[PDB]
Write a protein that binds this ligand. Structure first.
Ligand SMILES: Nc1nc2[nH]c(CCCCCCCC(=O)N[C@@H](CCC(=O)O)C(=O)O)cc2c(=O)[nH]1
Ligand SMILES: NCC(=O)N[C@@H]1O[C@H](COP(=O)([O-])[O-])[C@@H](O)[C@H]1O
Length: 200
């Protein structure tokens, strides 16, 4: 299966996906990395790995639909089967999500359905949980509400900050996102006709 990874930043999840998809038994290959932001470290990681990159600046487009159309054009150019959102921080439009339904994965640094949104660690710390984690899910129109594929719990330690908690949770992210991608790319897991997750 042919994979696009979309990013907005550092790209540690991208790097874990690059490493995993290059193992001999990988059912996924990463054929393009798309960033909505120029000059981010994730683009360096892609170039270093010999993977093509494109920057599609959302601030140059009139609305969300035009931006998504620009993304979609590149996805078609590279005959992409699966899209991974790996620190990509834009909400995708309904029609784009529907087109890629069952074919687009997102990583989120909480145990969904807790702490939906952009600042999950801040929320976790404010709430005072002692267990948080991360989630890979299929992308649905409703943000952070799509079908869950894998999750991993991560403890919150006394005195944690966003810096230390996000660091600990990223260790888990780098495990479950490659695992989830392999499950979907191998056809082991799919979004069922009833919309629920199906293990074949
Ligand atoms: N349809 C849909 N789009 C998705 N994108 C992402 C990937 C994760 C996106 C989380 C971004 C939230 C922070 C943010 O900046 N959101 C808006 C602006 C709202 C605001 O600034 O308060 C935006 O930038 O488009 C996941 C996901 C999903 O499950 N469903
Ligand atoms: N709402 C989505 C979200 O919060 N994504 C989070 O952004 C970080 C990106 O790190 P990276 O650029 O090093 O992969 C990751 O922690 C990811 O789960």
């Amino acid at each position: 299966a042919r994979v696009a990874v979309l990013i907005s930043g550092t790209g540690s999840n991208l790097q874990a996906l690059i490493d995993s998809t290059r193992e001999p038994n990988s059912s996924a290959q990463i054929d393009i990395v798309i960033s909505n932001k120029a000059a981010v470290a994730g683009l360096d990681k892609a170039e270093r790995a010999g993977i093509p990159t494109r920057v599609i600046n959302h601030k140059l487009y009139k609305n969300r639909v035009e931006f998504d159309s620009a993304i979609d054009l590149v996805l078609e150019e590279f005959s992409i089967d699966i899209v991974c959102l790996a620190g990509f921080m834009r909400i995708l439009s309904g029609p784009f999500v529907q087109k890629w339904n069952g074919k687009m994965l997102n990583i989120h640094p909480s145990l969904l359905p807790s702490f939906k949104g952009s600042n999950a660690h801040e929320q976790a710390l404010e709430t005072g949980v002692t267990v948080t984690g991360c989630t890979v899910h299929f992308v649905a129109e409703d943000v952070d509400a799509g079908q869950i594929i894998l999750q991993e719990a991560v403890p919150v330690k006394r005195g944690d900050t966003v810096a230390t908690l996000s660091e600990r949770v990223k260790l888990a992210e780098h495990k479950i996102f490659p695992a989830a991608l392999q499950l979907v790319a191998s056809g082991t897991v799919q979004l069922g006709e009833n919309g629920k997750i199906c293990w074949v």
